[PDB]
Design an enzyme around this catalytic site. Structure first.
Site, short mmCIF file in Angstrom:
data_model
loop_
_atom_site.label_atom_id
_atom_site.label_comp_id
_atom_site.label_asym_id
_atom_site.label_seq_id
_atom_site.Cartn_x
_atom_site.Cartn_y
_atom_site.Cartn_z
N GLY A 127 0.90 -1.11 0.00
CA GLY A 127 0.00 0.00 0.00
C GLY A 127 0.91 1.13 0.00
N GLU A 171 10.47 1.67 -2.99
CA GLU A 171 9.92 1.97 -4.34
C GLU A 171 9.72 3.52 -4.51
OE1 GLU A 171 5.72 0.89 -4.59
OE2 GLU A 171 5.68 1.33 -6.74
N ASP A 199 3.77 -6.36 -12.07
CA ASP A 199 2.97 -5.62 -11.13
C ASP A 199 1.53 -5.31 -11.16
OD1 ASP A 199 4.30 -2.70 -9.31
OD2 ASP A 199 2.83 -4.24 -8.72
N1 LIG Z 1 -2.85 -3.49 -6.79
C1 LIG Z 1 -2.23 -2.76 -5.86
N2 LIG Z 1 -1.09 -2.23 -6.21
N3 LIG Z 1 -2.75 -2.52 -4.63
C2 LIG Z 1 -2.64 -1.31 -3.99
N4 LIG Z 1 -1.68 -0.36 -4.08
C3 LIG Z 1 -1.85 0.98 -3.45
C4 LIG Z 1 -0.64 1.58 -3.58
C5 LIG Z 1 -0.46 2.88 -2.95
C6 LIG Z 1 0.87 3.40 -3.17
C7 LIG Z 1 1.69 2.52 -3.97
C8 LIG Z 1 3.10 2.85 -4.24
N5 LIG Z 1 3.14 4.27 -4.59
C9 LIG Z 1 2.59 4.77 -5.88
N6 LIG Z 1 2.68 6.04 -6.31
C10 LIG Z 1 2.25 6.07 -7.62
C11 LIG Z 1 2.16 7.08 -8.59
C12 LIG Z 1 1.68 6.70 -9.88
C13 LIG Z 1 1.32 5.36 -10.19
C14 LIG Z 1 1.42 4.37 -9.22
C15 LIG Z 1 1.88 4.73 -7.94
N7 LIG Z 1 2.11 3.98 -6.80
S1 LIG Z 1 0.85 1.12 -4.50
C16 LIG Z 1 -3.13 0.94 -3.08
S2 LIG Z 1 -4.01 -0.49 -3.28
ZN LIG Z 2 3.33 -4.36 -5.90
#
Ligand SMILES: NC(N)=Nc1nc(-c2ccc(CNc3nc4ccccc4[nH]3)s2)cs1
Ligand SMILES: [Zn+2]
Length: 349
Positions: free
Chosen positions: A181, A214, A292
């Site tokens: 997350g 990340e 991913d």
């Molecule tokens: N399927 C996935 N990935 N589940 C979940 N992932 C989140 C995430 C929150 C932050 C994450 C990492 N940071 C993040 N910042 C971003 C900017 C642009 C595109 C993608 C991004 N991911 S993943 C919420 S629910």
């Molecule tokens: Zn992931």
């Protein structure tokens, strides 16, 4: 044509960004939820990006479609079976695939996601249903498949129902706990629900993976390693911001779950500069190549190897080396892996 035609291992990919357009409407439209659309061809171009959005742009994408499949039992198993089927078209002999049960649930989970109302779609049914469609997929498409269940950082209340689901469904088919997350949340790694969940993991021998480094600095990678006790890192690009952590993961044979094409669209890796995986490859690191969120990134494993062939100079013994360190780092029980490694030495020469 495809960058590296041989078989492959993949260890980092999320169920809930690897659903098809098409069954986004079929459940969408059945269920009325309803989307930015009604062609099975243009969800794709809206909830798929082309270029680096932000964090809120990104999470809002989940908001259109998630509410079409979560909540509906039929669709939790659907997206399971269909996932296996994409991996075989990608030429993958083993995939570990991941997700949060909470985010599929519709009952039994505070708070309730995607704005939805009540229910009888339990978290535990979600795991049950996912296992299913996964398994029918190993048998039909001939990929072997395990799952990982995913703690949410902002939600340390879930985590213990997590490690316990991971011991409930052990081998049938969950091999590991994840943490994911948003790594922005200050001291998220170190919330007591996160720490105890991972301690319990250690106690009862579930494996362990962590998303870190990340969008998040190196100290988040050091807390994943020293306190959460992970055996592999989700991404970990920030490890390079901290050389002594480096030399030691490098000395320790840590495995890093790279998403290179993800690293662009997310902002993890900057356009101007150094690619984490080129450095990791000049230093002979234990890493793997991974998709991913293929929905949202408008991509296939071939996107990723293409990129790496077609910019960063990847020979194809790279490709082979890295898929060997990948099934080496897998969370297969010890016979299973030796068997996978076999398959791949046979194929590779
Ligand atoms: N399927 C996935 N990935 N589940 C979940 N992932 C989140 C995430 C929150 C932050 C994450 C990492 N940071 C993040 N910042 C971003 C900017 C642009 C595109 C993608 C991004 N991911 S993943 C919420 S629910
Ligand atoms: Zn992931």
């Amino acid at each position: 044509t495809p960058a590296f035609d041989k078989p492959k291992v993949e260890l980092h990919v999320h169920l809930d960004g690897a659903i098809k357009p098409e069954t986004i409407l079929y459940y969408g439209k059945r269920r009325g939820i309803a989307l930015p659309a009604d062609t099975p061809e243009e969800l794709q171009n809206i909830i798929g990006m082309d270029k680096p959005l932000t964090l809120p742009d990104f999470l809002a994408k989940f908001d259109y479609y998630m509410p079409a499949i979560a909540g509906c039992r039929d669709a939790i198993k659907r997206i399971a079976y269909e996932f296996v089927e994409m991996k075989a078209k990608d030429g993958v002999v083993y995939v570990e695939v991941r997700y949060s049960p909470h985010l599929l649930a519709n009952s039994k989970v505070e708070p309730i996601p995607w704005n939805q109302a009540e229910g009888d779609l339990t978290p535990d049914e979600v795991v049950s249903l996912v296992n299913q469609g996964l398994q029918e997929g190993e048998r039909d498409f001939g990929v072997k498949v395990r799952s990982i269940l995913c703690c949410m950082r902002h939600q340390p209340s879930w985590s213990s129902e997590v490690v316990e689901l991971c011991k409930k469904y052990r081998e049938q088919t969950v091999v590991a706990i994840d943490l994911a997350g948003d790594e922005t949340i200050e001291g998220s790694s170190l919330f007591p629900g996160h720490v105890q969940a991972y301690a319990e993991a250690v106690k009862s021998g579930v494996h362990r993976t962590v998303h870190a480094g990340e969008v998040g600095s190196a100290n988040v990678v050091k807390e994943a390693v020293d306190t959460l006790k992970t055996e592999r890192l989700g991404h970990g690009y920030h490890t390079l911001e901290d050389t002594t952590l480096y030399n030691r993961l490098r000395q320790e044979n840590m495995h890093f779950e790279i998403c290179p094409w993800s690293s662009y669209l997310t902002g993890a890796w900057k356009p101007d500069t150094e690619h984490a995986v080129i450095r990791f490859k000049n230093d002979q690191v234990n890493y793997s190549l991974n998709t991913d969120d293929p929905l949202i990134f408008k991509s296939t494993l071939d996107t990723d190897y293409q990129m790496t062939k077609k910019d960063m100079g990847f020979t194809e013994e790279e490709f082979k080396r890295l898929n060997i360190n990948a099934a080496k780092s897998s969370f297969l029980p010890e016979d299973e892996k030796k068997e996978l490694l076999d398959l791949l030495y046979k194929a590779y020469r």
